Design a protein around this ligand. Structure first.
Ligand SMILES: [Mg+2]
Ligand SMILES: [Mg+2]
Ligand SMILES: [Mg+2]
Ligand SMILES: [Mg+2]
Ligand SMILES: [Mg+2]
Ligand SMILES: [Mg+2]
Ligand SMILES: [Mg+2]
Ligand SMILES: [Mg+2]
Ligand SMILES: [Mg+2]
Ligand SMILES: [Mg+2]
Ligand SMILES: [Mg+2]
Ligand SMILES: [Mg+2]
Ligand SMILES: [Mg+2]
Ligand SMILES: [Mg+2]
Ligand SMILES: [Mg+2]
Ligand SMILES: [Mg+2]
Ligand SMILES: [Mg+2]
Ligand SMILES: [Mg+2]
Ligand SMILES: [Mg+2]
Ligand SMILES: [Mg+2]
Ligand SMILES: [Mg+2]
Ligand SMILES: [Mg+2]
Ligand SMILES: [Mg+2]
Ligand SMILES: [Mg+2]
Ligand SMILES: [Mg+2]
Ligand SMILES: [Mg+2]
Ligand SMILES: [Mg+2]
Ligand SMILES: [Mg+2]
Ligand SMILES: [Mg+2]
Ligand SMILES: [Mg+2]
Ligand SMILES: [Mg+2]
Ligand SMILES: [Mg+2]
Ligand SMILES: [Mg+2]
Ligand SMILES: [Mg+2]
Ligand SMILES: [Mg+2]
Ligand SMILES: [Mg+2]
Ligand SMILES: [Mg+2]
Lengths: 98, 244, 77, 122, 240, 75
RNA sequence: ACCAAAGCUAGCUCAACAUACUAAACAAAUACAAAAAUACACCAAAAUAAAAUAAAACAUUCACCUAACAUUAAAGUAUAGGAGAUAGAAAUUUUUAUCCUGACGC
RNA sequence: GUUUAAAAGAACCAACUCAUCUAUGUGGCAAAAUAGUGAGAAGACUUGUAGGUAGAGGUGAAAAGCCUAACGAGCCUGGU
RNA sequence: CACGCUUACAUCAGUAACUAAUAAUAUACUGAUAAUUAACAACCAAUAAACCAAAACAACACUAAAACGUUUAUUAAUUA
RNA sequence: UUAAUUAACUAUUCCAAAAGUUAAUAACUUAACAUGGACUAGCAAUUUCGGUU
């Protein structure tokens, strides 16, 4: 994904009308490149016992490549959303008792 | 000689007239509404007013969406709502230099994505922003059901949405005839996007497809006039019998 | 080996089915009702057309093994 | 050079171009290259007997004409099927499930000269 | 419009089929190769470059065939030879001393003993002596003799190490392949093709070579006697 | 059937008798019944031309009525 | 005296209203080489606007340039400009229905 | 047709294909002709029908030739 | 005869004028009436196999390797 | 073209992206495609040829 910005400013139109663009308004400057920024980490909760990451029921941050190629398609981990986090929380609550 | 109605409303008049009017009102309103898509390439600004760094006064700044082009090959995949950016640039980042036309294209990837509701692996040409939107929505079907048409901008995505909505509304046992418990568990975690059947089959349809479906639903053979004549004769005979 | 067929002169493979045909439990909207092509609609796959009444001249040729004189031992005529 | 206003006919073309003037085909090409005519495609002109037919191509000038009354479906029904249907309803034998005896036909492919596909020329 | 190729023939045919030459014209219609066209009417003789090809899959053992006749071929520089084996005939590229009424062997059995290298023999490279002259070599086992075919041209087997054959091509370059690549032993027929003398400008028009353009172009940096080192050995063995 | 040919016009296309269905006929398959994105301009042009013809015919009738009224003051 | 000149009509142009916008004809044939009744298919395609002008030149730029929001004002203001030629808002204001439509247009 | 064991990109010379030289013609027979006179004439040959290569190009045995009578780059329309 | 123009073709009548680059009259104008008749020509089988071996009087040859074809088995509506 | 601005495309190379491989944050490869940013050359794109003599 590329991020571009206009050189010449566009005159305003605040009455719900579309801005009156011109030929020179097509001059774009590449102000940011998303593929060049430092990539973030993907946090996932394991549903099985992985040798590399850890035991079942653990939240770990792995790189997006492995997170999308190994854990999710094979069912080794699920998303870190609260809907799936509540299940792990109740599983831990039931496990730590007996 | 002038047009009484301008050309800007001829499409709206053609929609309000013809067979287009016989379409369901929910689909008509879904096509009428014009929601601005999410900023995918241009970076928007927060506040509506801004202090001019040169003039030191308040001025209203309005966001102008940058026109993007979607090739027909984007409709066969899920590019997350982006496409080809056609524009101009100044070489060497200097205004006084020449003007050069440029076509920025997204980095395409041949990826296979598995869906839970349909239980099939589709080889869809998605991009890094598509994968990031998927991981942000925490689910392929979650992303499909949450992102609207104006954000998808993909006929393939609209077809996926319509199919999974029809499945959720009909409670199709064909999902897992062997595991009804698993079928119910899959259906329960998507109960926030339940849409009735009267509208679940009119979301991922274009104008021509909707017109064709309405034509197929309204297509009936002409009733022979013998039936109408026999009905009128029976009515007259009943009236003559009751008037005696 | 080297196959004596050329991709440009061979019969082309039918185009890939539209993305509406990969949606389980959904009937695609095609142009089979209007009996003519229109852009934007799906590609209707038609069943094998069977000429219920046998026409002599415009029918396909029956296979070799269908004939009653078809035998397993090849004869060198 | 050439013309574009006159109609493109069979005489303004080469030997390899032989377009028919509009006649209807009556057969196909055989085996040895000849033309095999089919007796089922040729129009069999069904002409009746005009010997005992007492009618002339002209009418008497003293004969009066009639008011222009186009025959319509309702009048045809009232003349043909209305009496039988009314009699059956008065007798109590009317059946809305079967109306074939009054002249109504469910489909057209049953008889020879169907109406909607228009199998007969004239 | 776009032109259609003449090569629509899936079945193999011993009889020469007709061909439609096209002078420097691609499927579009523009001239892409200068100096081709206006040639004599020529047929096309189908050549089976896969030498070791059994007739029936029931008996895949090495097989012997007999040469019928060695004829001239207008498509290539070498002379063709019709050879019949079993119930089918085929055109192959005749070697130097291949005459009418000769015996040709086609084998793929690799053995610890070296096999006597004849001219008609077609054995894998691993079973041939380390100093032989071969031609019509292959790239992969079962791919086809894409390499040397010209009249008089012949490569030389150099060494065999770790189950891998090394040959030297007419361009003095080394080619490393697997020992299962079937090749024909000996030199290609018509070794006097380079010694020929075109008598007049008419023979070029007969063969289909239009003359060069007359635009006098000054020589650039490309011209000159460039003494380049020998390129590295080209290997086809996909090492893990 | 009411068809819309490539010329943007609406025609009453009749049906012909065929021994094969519509999806197997070479002569009928390569016929196009739809409007291209370049035909709307010509459709609008024809609409404008017809509107102009009707307008000038109306003006002619109006002026002729005026002329007749000025010629015969029988009112 | 020949050659000759003169008529006032066919009709158009500009607008306002306006049903709400590809007229009538479509018996048969009409995207085979159109007006040819008749056989196992194939059908479809997009990718920025350019310059001729000005800046007495010409490279950055050059209103409209076949994309709707109209009108009275803000205002030719803030701003954008080889800071040159030129371009150019917005916030915020005004707009009361119908008939009275024909022509100091040929 | 003739010379030649020759169908030898041989030679004389017809139909045929080009156009060397001169004379008429220059709003002429003709927007490139006629007459006389020349070269090739079994081949790198002429020609009938039909298809393709399209102008930021096509093509070119380079003349910066030809691309429907004006080609240092065709014609029409639009910008105009 | 093939390609191309469509009636300019044939009979009667007239040419004061229109067309012939001029008169006569008339295949080149005007009006009317009739016309080219198929055996010649156009359209007028596939499905797989057997099929290497030139045309030049073609006996047999050279190189530039050469257009032009039958038989077999299954289906080709059967009737001026 | 040894003039001034430098395109698109094609052959180089590099980096980023993606696919991945090894071990207790580290090192390495890219078959056909393939995006963005830099490098070398062709194909080349626009413009001009100061004045008194
Ligand atoms: Mg305002
Ligand atoms: Mg003309
Ligand atoms: Mg003709
Ligand atoms: Mg003719
Ligand atoms: Mg007959
Ligand atoms: Mg050869
Ligand atoms: Mg060759
Ligand atoms: Mg040379
Ligand atoms: Mg030279
Ligand atoms: Mg310019
Ligand atoms: Mg200027
Ligand atoms: Mg000036
Ligand atoms: Mg401009
Ligand atoms: Mg500045
Ligand atoms: Mg200045
Ligand atoms: Mg000679
Ligand atoms: Mg001279
Ligand atoms: Mg002469
Ligand atoms: Mg003289
Ligand atoms: Mg001579
Ligand atoms: Mg000479
Ligand atoms: Mg001779
Ligand atoms: Mg130029
Ligand atoms: Mg050129
Ligand atoms: Mg020169
Ligand atoms: Mg010169
Ligand atoms: Mg010209
Ligand atoms: Mg003429
Ligand atoms: Mg005269
Ligand atoms: Mg006459
Ligand atoms: Mg320079
Ligand atoms: Mg230049
Ligand atoms: Mg420019
Ligand atoms: Mg220039
Ligand atoms: Mg100067
Ligand atoms: Mg001077
Ligand atoms: Mg001087």
């Amino acid at each position: 994904t590329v991020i571009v910005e206009r050189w010449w400013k566009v005159p305003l139109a605040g009455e719900g009308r579309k801005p009156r663009l011109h030929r020179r308004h097509r001059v774009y400057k590449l102000v940011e490149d998303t593929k060049h920024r430092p990539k973030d980490n993907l946090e996932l909760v394991l549903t099985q016992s992985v040798e590399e990451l850890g035991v079942r029921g653990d939240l770990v941050s792995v790189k997006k490549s492995v997170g999308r190629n190994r854990l999710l398609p094979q069912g080794l981990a699920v998303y870190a959303s609260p809907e799936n986090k509540k299940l792990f929380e109740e599983e831990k609550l039931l496990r730590q008792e007996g | 000689p002038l047009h009484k109605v301008p050309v800007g409303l001829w499409k709206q008049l053609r929609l309000w007239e013809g067979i287009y009017s016989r379409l369901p009102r929910h689909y008509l309103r879904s096509l009428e509404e014009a929601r601005t898509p999410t900023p995918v390439h241009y970076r928007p600004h927060g506040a509506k007013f801004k202090i001019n760094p040169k003039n030191w006064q308040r001025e209203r700044v309005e966001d102008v969406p940058i026109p993007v082009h979607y090739p027909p090959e984007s409709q066969l995949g899920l590019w997350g709502g982006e496409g080809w950016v056609l524009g101009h640039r100044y070489v060497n980042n200097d205004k006084l230099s020449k003007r050069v036309r440029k076509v920025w294209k997204p980095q395409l990837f041949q990826r296979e994505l598995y869906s839970e509701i349909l239980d099939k692996r589709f080889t869809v040409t998605v991009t890094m922003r598509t994968l990031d939107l998927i991981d942000q929505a925490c689910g392929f079907d979650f992303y499909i059901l949450k992102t609207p048409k104006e954000d998808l901008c993909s006929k393939f995505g609209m077809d996926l949405k319509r199919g999974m909505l029809l499945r959720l509304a009909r409670q199709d046992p064909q999902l897992h005839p062997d595991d009804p418990a698993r079928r119910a568990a899959i259906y329960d975690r998507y109960k926030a996007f339940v849409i009735p059947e009267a509208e679940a089959e009119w979301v991922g349809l274009t104008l021509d497809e909707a017109v064709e479906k309405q034509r197929l639903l309204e297509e009936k053979d002409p009733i022979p006039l013998f039936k109408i004549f026999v009905e009128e004769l029976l009515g007259q005979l009943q009236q003559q019998a009751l008037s005696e | 080996a080297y196959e004596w067929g050329v991709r440009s002169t061979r019969k082309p493979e039918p185009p890939p089915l539209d993305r509406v045909y990969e949606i389980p439990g959904l009937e695609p909207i095609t142009y089979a009702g209007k009996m003519h092509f229109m852009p934007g609609l799906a590609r209707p796959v038609f069943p094998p057309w069977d000429p219920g009444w046998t026409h002599p001249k415009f029918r396909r040729l029956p296979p070799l093994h269908e004939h009653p004189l078809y035998k397993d031992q090849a004869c060198y005529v | 050079g050439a013309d574009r206003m006159s109609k493109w006919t069979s005489k303004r073309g080469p030997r390899t171009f032989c377009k028919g003037r509009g006649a209807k085909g009556t057969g196909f090409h055989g085996r040895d290259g000849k033309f095999v005519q089919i007796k089922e495609m040729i129009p069999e002109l069904v002409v009746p007997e005009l010997a005992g037919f007492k009618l002339k191509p002209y009418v008497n000038y003293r004969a009066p004409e009639g008011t222009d009354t186009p025959l319509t479906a309702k009048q045809l029904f009232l003349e043909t099927a209305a009496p039988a249907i009314e009699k059956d309803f008065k007798a109590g034998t009317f059946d809305p499930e079967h109306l074939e005896k009054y002249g109504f036909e469910p489909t057209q492919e049953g008889k020879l000269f169907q109406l909607y596909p228009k199998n007969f020329p004239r | 419009a776009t032109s259609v190729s003449w090569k629509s023939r899936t079945k193999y045919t011993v009889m020469p089929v007709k061909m439609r030459k096209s002078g420097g014209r691609n499927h579009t219609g523009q001239i892409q190769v200068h100096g081709i066209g206006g040639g004599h009417k020529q047929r096309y003789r189908m050549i089976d470059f896969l030498r070791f090809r059994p007739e029936h899959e029931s008996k895949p053992g090495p097989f012997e065939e007999k040469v019928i006749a060695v004829r001239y071929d207008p498509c290539r520089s070498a002379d063709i030879a019709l050879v019949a084996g079993g119930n089918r005939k085929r055109w192959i590229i005749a070697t130097e001393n291949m005459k009418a009424g000769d015996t040709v062997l086609n084998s793929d059995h690799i053995g610890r003993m070296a096999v006597a290298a004849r001219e008609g023999d077609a054995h894998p490279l691993g079973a041939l002596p380390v100093g032989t002259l071969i031609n019509n070599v292959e790239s992969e086992p079962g791919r086809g003799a894409q390499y040397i075919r010209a009249a008089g041209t012949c490569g030389v087997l150099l060494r065999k190490v770790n189950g891998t054959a090394i040959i030297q091509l007419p361009s003095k370059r080394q080619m490393q392949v697997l020992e299962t690549c079937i090749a024909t032993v000996g030199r290609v027929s018509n070794v006097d093709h380079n010694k020929r003398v075109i008598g007049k400008a008419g023979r070029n028009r007969w063969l289909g070579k239009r003359p060069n353009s007359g635009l006098w172009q000054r020589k650039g940096g490309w011209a000159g006697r460039k003494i380049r080192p020998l390129p590295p050995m080209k290997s086809y063995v996909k090492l893990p | 059937a009411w068809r819309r040919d490539i010329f943007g016009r609406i025609i009453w296309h009749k049906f012909k008798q065929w021994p094969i269905p519509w999806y197997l006929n070479k002569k009928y398959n390569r016929k196009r019944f739809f409007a291209m994105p370049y035909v709307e301009r010509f459709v609008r042009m024809r609409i404008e031309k017809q509107a102009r013809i009707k307008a000038r015919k109306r003006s002619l009738e109006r002026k002729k009525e005026k002329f007749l009224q000025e010629k015969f003051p029988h009112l």
